[PDB]
Amino acid sequence: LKPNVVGRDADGNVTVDGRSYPMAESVVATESTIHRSMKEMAQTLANAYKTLKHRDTHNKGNSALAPITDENPLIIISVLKGSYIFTADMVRYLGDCGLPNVVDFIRITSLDNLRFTELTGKHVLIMEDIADTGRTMKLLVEKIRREYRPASLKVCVLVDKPGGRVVDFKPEFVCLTAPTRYVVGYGFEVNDRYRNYRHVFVLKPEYAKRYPSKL
Amino acid sequence: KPNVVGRDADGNVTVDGRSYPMAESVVATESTIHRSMKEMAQTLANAYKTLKHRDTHNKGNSALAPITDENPLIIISVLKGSYIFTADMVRYLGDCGLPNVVDFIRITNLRFTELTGKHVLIMEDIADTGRTMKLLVEKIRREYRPASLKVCVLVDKPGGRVVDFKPEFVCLTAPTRYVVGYGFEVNDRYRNYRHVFVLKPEYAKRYPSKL
Ligand SMILES: Nc1nc2c(ncn2C[C@@H](COCP(=O)(O)O)OC[C@@H](O)P(=O)(O)O)c(=O)[nH]1
Numbered sequence: 001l002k003p004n005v006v007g008r009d010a011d012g013n014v015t016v017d018g019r020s021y022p023m024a025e026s027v028v029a030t031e032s033t034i035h036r037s038m039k040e041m042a043q044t045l046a047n048a049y050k051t052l053k054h055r056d057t058h059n060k061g062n063s064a065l066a067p068i069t070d071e072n073p074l075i076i077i078s079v080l081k082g083s084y085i086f087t088a089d090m091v092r093y094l095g096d097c098g099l100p101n102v103v104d105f106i107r108i109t110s111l112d113n114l115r116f117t118e119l120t121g122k123h124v125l126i127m128e129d130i131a132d133t134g135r136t137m138k139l140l141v142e143k144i145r146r147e148y149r150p151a152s153l154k155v156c157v158l159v160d161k162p163g164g165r166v167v168d169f170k171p172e173f174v175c176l177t178a179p180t181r182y183v184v185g186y187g188f189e190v191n192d193r194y195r196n197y198r199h200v201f202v203l204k205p206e207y208a209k210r211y212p213s214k215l
Numbered sequence: 216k217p218n219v220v221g222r223d224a225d226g227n228v229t230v231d232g233r234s235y236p237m238a239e240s241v242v243a244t245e246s247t248i249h250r251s252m253k254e255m256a257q258t259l260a261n262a263y264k265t266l267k268h269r270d271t272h273n274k275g276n277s278a279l280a281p282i283t284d285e286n287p288l289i290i291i292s293v294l295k296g297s298y299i300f301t302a303d304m305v306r307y308l309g310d311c312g313l314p315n316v317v318d319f320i321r322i323t324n325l326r327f328t329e330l331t332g333k334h335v336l337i338m339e340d341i342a343d344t345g346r347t348m349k350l351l352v353e354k355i356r357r358e359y360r361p362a363s364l365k366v367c368v369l370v371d372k373p374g375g376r377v378v379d380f381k382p383e384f385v386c387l388t389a390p391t392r393y394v395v396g397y398g399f400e401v402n403d404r405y406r407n408y409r410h411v412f413v414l415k416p417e418y419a420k421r422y423p424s425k426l
């Protein structure tokens with residue numbers, strides 16, 4: 001939550017706190033902005049699920065609905081790969097707000113299904129890093145809904161790019177909004193590069209095909 | 216940054232006012248964990264910074280290439296218990312200026328194919344008996360043939376060693392007890408906690424239901 005300083009070096013490259021980022025054209029959101037919006041999002045999510053009830057799978061002898069506890073946590077589906085840093089930070093923030101949850105990962109590239117089998121009648125939250133065309137999440141929502149029929153199925157995204165929509169999809173929860181540009185940093189990649197950066201940047205167009213070689 | 220560890224009215228372990236009824240005791244608070252990882256990031260950095268390996272960015276070049284954004288350090292992370300640890304770690308690695316990329320493998324899966332002649336580092340949450348990592352190391356070394364293959368762990372429990380395996384890099388050393396928090400869990404519970412706790416034995420079988 002430390003305040004970040006955005007500037008330019010002598011070469012004219014975008015710098016954040018003295019560190020130069022030659023691949024960046026501009027700054028979408030510094031680390032401070034990102035975590036501030038995730039802390040408030042955690043509180044938003046906590047308020048939305050705190051008093052909710054879903055099917056009891058801890059005790060199968062019970063027929064009544066059960067509140068969200070450690071026995072019957074919120075089911076969080078994290079979308080590999082870009083969402084793993086976003087998810088790691090968020091679940092800890094959710095813990096601060098006292099929201100019981102468990103995470104299973106799925107790998108989608110428009111492939112690697114869930115290990116969880118009890119999603120029926122459960123409150124499920126999908127954690128995706130970014131929504132652009134909306135195709136990835138639209139396909140994922142109807143797939144999860146058809147195969148499991150959860151009590152609820154909402155989507156939380158770190159970054160939303162509404163200007164790039166091609167289908168009818170709206171994330172219930174949105175941490176940040178970005179312009180219709182290719183962004184990098186904090187999960188966002190260019191052939192797995194720049195993923196571990198602490199800020200979200202607009203990528204220079206001349207860096208789009210920087211690393212075409214197979215990893 | 217430093218965390219206040221105490222006890223509430225019921226004798227339950229508390230960290231920063233928040234009670235943890237499942238905890239027997241605190242292994243390491245968030246501040247300690249993060250301090251260790253920052254130092255480990257520096258250790259890793261100084262160990263790979265000057266290293267050189269196969270250039271796959273430019274296959275036209277036959278000479279070895281330094282670790283750059285073109286040819287990054289290959290990091291293999293093990294789902295699921297190691298993703299939070301890996302998340303924090305790669306960022307500290309970014310601070311220390313070490314280019315790296317991460318692929319995940321689930322064991323209880325690698326999509327990267329070009330590890331040959333590359334420096335590879337495995338990020339694992341815990342090493343106990345050593346069986347999990349000894350098997351993973353041998354599999355990679357014969358099915359990818361890397362230039363180097365070292366393991367970095369968050370928690371080492373050397374009193375649990377029953378096979379021939381010693382991780383090159385260790386953040387925290389713990390006794391032979393079952394721990395929860397910060398990646399470690401019991402049936403996926405308590406994984407999101409910011410600290411590592413010794414679990415009460417009675418809580419070991421608290422969630423027998425399949426997820
Ligand atoms: N780095 C980066 N990637 C983007 C961006 N916008 C879209 N992608 C692709 C994909 C990310 O996932 C990883 P990958 O598996 O695709 O490599 O997300 C697809 C959904 O946004 P969609 O368009 O709704 O389907 C962006 O601004 N930056």
Ligand SMILES: Nc1nc2c(ncn2C[C@@H](COCP(=O)(O)O)OC[C@@H](O)P(=O)(O)O)c(=O)[nH]1
Pocket residue numbers: 295296322323341342343344345346347348392393394395399400401
């Ligand atoms: N929460 C927690 N988990 C632990 C602990 N000790 C070991 N594990 C997990 C174990 C495999 O667990 C299967 P999974 O559910 O994680 O997939 O991993 C041990 C291998 O590293 P080993 O060295 O070969 O024995 C511990 O103290 N606390």
